[PDB]
Amino acid sequence: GRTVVVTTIMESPYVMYKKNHEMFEGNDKYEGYCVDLASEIAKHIGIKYKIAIVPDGKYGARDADTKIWNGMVGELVYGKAEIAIAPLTITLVREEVIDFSKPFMSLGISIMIKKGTPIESAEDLAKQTEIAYGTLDSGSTKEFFRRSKIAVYEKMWTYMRSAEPSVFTRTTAEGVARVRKSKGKFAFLLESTMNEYIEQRKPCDTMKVGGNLDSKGYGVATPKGSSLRTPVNLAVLKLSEAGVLDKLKNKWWYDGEC
Amino acid sequence: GRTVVVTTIMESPYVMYKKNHEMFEGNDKYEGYCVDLASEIAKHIGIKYKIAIVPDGKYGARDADTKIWNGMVGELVYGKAEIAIAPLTITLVREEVIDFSKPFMSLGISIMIKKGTPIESAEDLAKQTEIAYGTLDSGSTKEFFRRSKIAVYEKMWTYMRSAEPSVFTRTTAEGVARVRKSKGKFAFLLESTMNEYIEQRKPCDTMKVGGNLDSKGYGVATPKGSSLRTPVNLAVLKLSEAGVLDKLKNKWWYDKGEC
Numbered sequence: 068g069r070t071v072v073v074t075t076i077m078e079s080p081y082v083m084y085k086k087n088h089e090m091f092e093g094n095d096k097y098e099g100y101c102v103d104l105a106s107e108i109a110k111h112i113g114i115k116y117k118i119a120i121v122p123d124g125k126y127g128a129r130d131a132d133t134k135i136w137n138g139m140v141g142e143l144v145y146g147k148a149e150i151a152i153a154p155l156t157i158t159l160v161r162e163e164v165i166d167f168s169k170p171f172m173s174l175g176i177s178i179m180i181k182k183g184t185p186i187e188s189a190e191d192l193a194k195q196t197e198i199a200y201g202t203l204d205s206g207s208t209k210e211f212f213r214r215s216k217i218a219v220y221e222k223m224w225t226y227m228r229s230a231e232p233s234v235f236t237r238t239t240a241e242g243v244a245r246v247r248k249s250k251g252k253f254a255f256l257l258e259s260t261m262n263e264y265i266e267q268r269k270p271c272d273t274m275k276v277g278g279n280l281d282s283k284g285y286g287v288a289t290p291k292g293s294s295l296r297t298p299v300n301l302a303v304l305k306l307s308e309a310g311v312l313d314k315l316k317n318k319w320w321y322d323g324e325c
Numbered sequence: 326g327r328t329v330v331v332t333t334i335m336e337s338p339y340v341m342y343k344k345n346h347e348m349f350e351g352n353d354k355y356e357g358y359c360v361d362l363a364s365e366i367a368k369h370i371g372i373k374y375k376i377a378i379v380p381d382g383k384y385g386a387r388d389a390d391t392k393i394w395n396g397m398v399g400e401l402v403y404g405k406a407e408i409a410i411a412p413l414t415i416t417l418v419r420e421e422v423i424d425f426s427k428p429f430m431s432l433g434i435s436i437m438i439k440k441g442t443p444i445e446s447a448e449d450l451a452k453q454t455e456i457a458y459g460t461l462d463s464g465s466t467k468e469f470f471r472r473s474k475i476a477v478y479e480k481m482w483t484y485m486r487s488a489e490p491s492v493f494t495r496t497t498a499e500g501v502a503r504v505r506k507s508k509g510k511f512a513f514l515l516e517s518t519m520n521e522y523i524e525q526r527k528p529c530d531t532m533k534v535g536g537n538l539d540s541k542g543y544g545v546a547t548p549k550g551s552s553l554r555t556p557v558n559l560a561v562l563k564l565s566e567a568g569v570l571d572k573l574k575n576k577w578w579y580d581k582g583e584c
């Protein structure tokens with residue numbers, strides 16, 4: 068049939084450029100967990116597809132002033148893509164406007180610090196003001212803190228909401244770079260999958276501290292009314308039960324540069 | 326509105342009889358994680374309901390001979406209930422015949438042994454014949470071994486399917502009893518949630534060994550075409566993000582240090 072448009076995002080090790088990607092066309096320019104997942108799903112449900120990187124580089128939330136959805140979620144809602152295959156977190160606010168498959172990977176919000184930083188936990192962050200901390204803007208992590216009725220997270224939100232200059236970044240890379248270049252005066256709140264990948268690679272100057280703040284999952288997303296909803300959901304469960312999801316995780320998170 | 330029939334199963338600490346249960350009527354006879362979850366869901370989607378314990382006491386599988394679904398799955402498929410709220414595992418074969426909400430709890434298949442048993446892993450079980458081992462009948466754990474293409478689990482399946490006496494069990498309670506009564510000559514394959522709960526309570530003679538064999542979840546189930554599907558799904562995610570599922574898990578699994 069038609070070539071299905073798959074929206075995704077540049078985020079290591081989910082979607083990355085190959086070395087010498089310039090020598091490849093279309094999908095063959097990319098590699099990573101979600102590139103592999105797309106291939107596996109497409110094989111199961113029998114579709115041709117084209118990876119399209121989300122133009123605004125965002126995951127998906129409502130613009131504060133217009134309320135229009137941005138990022139990958141927006142691409143699905145407004146007709147520009149037919150499937151999102153990415154580290155896109157399954158949340159209520161998103162499930163109300165798009166459909167998610169059952170989860171293909173588990174994660175939680177976690178704390179990234181530069182090695183040496185005097186911080187062991189969220190409580191440690193919330194106590195003080197010397198070390199600044201923040202999250203991605205326009206995503207599930209920022210929403211977690213704004214929503215929370217837990218004392219420590221409420222305190223963290225009240226700080227982050229009003230901090231100057233902004234503690235919110237547009238990409239995870241931006242947050243991680245800030246951690247590395249701030250000499251221990253910045254901690255970044257990001258999902259455990261990313262945190263753990265990054266701490267096992269050069270320059271080996273960051274680490275995850277404490278446990279995860281919550282527990283949830285990533286899912287493959289389709290626009291409401293899509294004929295791909297059920298096929299995609301069953302495909303994810305098939306891959307789960309055949310051990311393929313586990314195999315791909317071990318492949319892309321394999322450790323020992325550090 | 327109507328009183329919705331909720332199918333569930335007696336399984337501690339998801340669904341248990343209250344002390345002096347004969348002194349209570351209807352829903353008030355029960356307590357547990359899934360009883361609380363049922364109340365929270367009904368409240369968020371605005372329904373009245375009646376808890377009805379699954380008559381055959383099974384989770385649910387498609388009978389090989391008759392091709393008829395049993396357990397809670399069957400109750401939904403054949404119109405005997407409208408929602409299943411229980412530690413029912415989300416699987417491909419079940420998803421083909423009923424709908425599941427996003428997961429409310431994570432788990433994996435695990436190994437239960439009697440303390441002292443010389444077993445530390447699935448591989449240990451497989452390369453050995455002295456100690457027997459099996460699973461529940463009529464659920465996801467048995468199907469896992471039946472379907473596995475992994476060497477170690479295939480070997481385990483070939484043994485179990487022909488073992489004598491039969492190693493398959495009716496309820497987790499009976500599996501746990503067989504582990505306790507077999508003085509170390511039986512190991513029981515059950516999900517981590519049950520394994521961990523049982524390990525921390527008297528008589529404190531069992532334990533989980535090794536990591537989980539897989540990673541999956543439980544979901545709330547509804548029959549295909551149900552008008553309750555979406556409200557149920559949104560309620561589970563709302564409860565999750567509100568910290569309520571966390572609160573319930575820590576309440577019902579709280580370790581009072583009996584061991």
Ligand SMILES: Cc1onc(O)c1C[C@H](N)C(=O)O
Pocket residue numbers: 078126127154155156203205206207208209239256257258261
């Ligand atoms: C990936 C990642 O890592 N940390 C985050 O906040 C994210 C984005 C998050 N998964 C979202 O869907 O908004």
Ligand SMILES: Cc1onc(O)c1C[C@H](N)C(=O)O
Pocket residue numbers: 336384385412413414461463464465466467497514515516519
């Ligand atoms: C609960 C439980 O604990 N171990 C098991 O195998 C089960 C049953 C399993 N959750 C099912 O849905 O079949």
